[PDB]
Amino acid sequence: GPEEITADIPNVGEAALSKLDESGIVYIGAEVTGGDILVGKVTPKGETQL
Amino acid sequence: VPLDGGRFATSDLNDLYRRVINRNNRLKRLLDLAAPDIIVRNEKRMLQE
């Protein structure tokens, strides 16, 4: 499936988006630590599993 | 195990025991049919392989 950067981002709230602007990409000088997300990456799923 | 899309990511362990048995049942079939020697014995060749 044609991938889009960030776009649809589940498994988080808006706290993670405090540094993920109107593009879902990381800020212009953030303090990322431990296990946060740099850039959003979306990918489709599957037939057999639905 | 199923693969995302509609295929299979299976380890050939299955695809060999399936062979051990495809050939095996075909062999017992070939004996109820009572086929000639060298042919059903060529089947035992495939059984040992």
UniProtKB/Swiss-Prot annotation, chain A:
Quaternary structure, from the entry: The RNAP catalytic core consists of 2 alpha, 1 beta, 1 beta' and 1 omega subunit. When a sigma factor is associated with the core the holoenzyme is formed, which can initiate transcription.
Full-sequence portion shown in this chain: 846 to 895 of 1342
Annotated family: Belongs to the RNA polymerase beta chain family.
Protein's name according to its UniProt entry: DNA-directed RNA polymerase subunit beta
Superkingdom of the organism of origin: Bacteria
Task of the protein: DNA-dependent RNA polymerase catalyzes the transcription of DNA into RNA using the four ribonucleoside triphosphates as substrates.
UniProtKB/Swiss-Prot annotation, chain B:
S-S bonds: none
Family membership noted in the UniProt record: Belongs to the RNA polymerase beta' chain family.
Function: DNA-dependent RNA polymerase catalyzes the transcription of DNA into RNA using the four ribonucleoside triphosphates as substrates.
Assembly and binders: The RNAP catalytic core consists of 2 alpha, 1 beta, 1 beta' and 1 omega subunit. When a sigma factor is associated with the core the holoenzyme is formed, which can initiate transcription.
Listed name of the protein: DNA-directed RNA polymerase subunit beta'
Gene source species: Escherichia coli O157:H7
